Design a binder for this molecule. Structure first.
Ligand SMILES: COc1ccc2c(n1)C(C)(C)NC2=O
Ligand SMILES: COc1ccc2c(n1)C(C)(C)NC2=O
Length: 209
């Protein structure tokens, strides 16, 4: 059973701006997704201080970067707090509305797309490099879900029947045909070192076979 939802008009507008604007410095998408993963990890770690049982779904706090050339995907996996169904449909988008308006105003005043994370809507930079984004997520208080959007104004949510993740979030970037440099080990290594070198969780860059 697949549910289809419309983005808020303001978020659709943000996504079209990201897709349509000419802007060569696309690599910052990775910093933004890793930053989100670090925030999610910080959150479950803080909650576990007063309720250790929140780590019964997995003690390890880490980020994995997994390229796959056959599928032309780059996956950013974390074992952070995860997202509930309400997070996926409502909560994050509610919070994103104000960040989007501020980001739009900053751009008109001379900011650039690389500053998107300073407004709390860095996730949508994924559409600098991906034609489709799939998000698999599992929060301790909810079931495992799959969210997906190719932009165009809509997204879907369904219960996920794939491999159980335990707890956390996988962001699967279905890369655009001209963005496959982000599958290469040396390129990902370079970007992590430049923009994410002090993240307080181990980042493991998987190798392809
Ligand atoms: C990467 O997984 C998550 C899970 C929950 C949350 C987030 N990311 C952000 C976007 C940092 N805000 C949340 O509430
Ligand atoms: C997976 O990490 C995130 C971060 C921010 C956001 C999202 N996911 C969705 C739920 C797609 N909407 C957001 O604003």
């Amino acid at each position: 059973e697949v549910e289809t939802f419309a983005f808020q008009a303001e978020i659709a507008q943000l996504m079209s701006l990201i897709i349509n604007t000419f802007y060569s410095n696309k690599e910052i998408f990775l910093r933004e997704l890793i930053s989100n993963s670090s925030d999610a990890l910080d959150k479950i770690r803080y909650e576990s201080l007063t309720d250790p049982s929140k780590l019964d779904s997995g003690k390890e706090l880490h980020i994995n970067l997994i390229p796959n050339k056959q599928d032309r995907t780059l996956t950013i996996v974390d074992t952070g707090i995860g997202m509930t169904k309400a997070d996926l449909i409502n909560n994050l988008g509610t919070i994103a509305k104000s960040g989007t308006k501020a980001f739009m105003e900053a751009l008109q005043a001379g900011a650039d797309i690389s500053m998107i994370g300073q407004f709390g809507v860095g996730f949508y930079s994924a559409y600098l490099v991906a034609e489709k984004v799939t998000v698999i997520t599992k929060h301790n208080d909810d079931e495992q879900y799959a969210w997906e959007s190719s932009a165009g104004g809509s997204f879907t949510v369904r219960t996920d029947t794939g491999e159980p993740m335990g707890r956390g979030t996988k962001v699967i970037l279905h890369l655009k045909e001209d963005q496959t440099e982000y599958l290469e080990e040396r390129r990902i290594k370079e970007i992590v070192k430049k923009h994410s070198q002090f993240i307080g969780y181990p980042i493991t860059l998987f190798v392809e076979k």
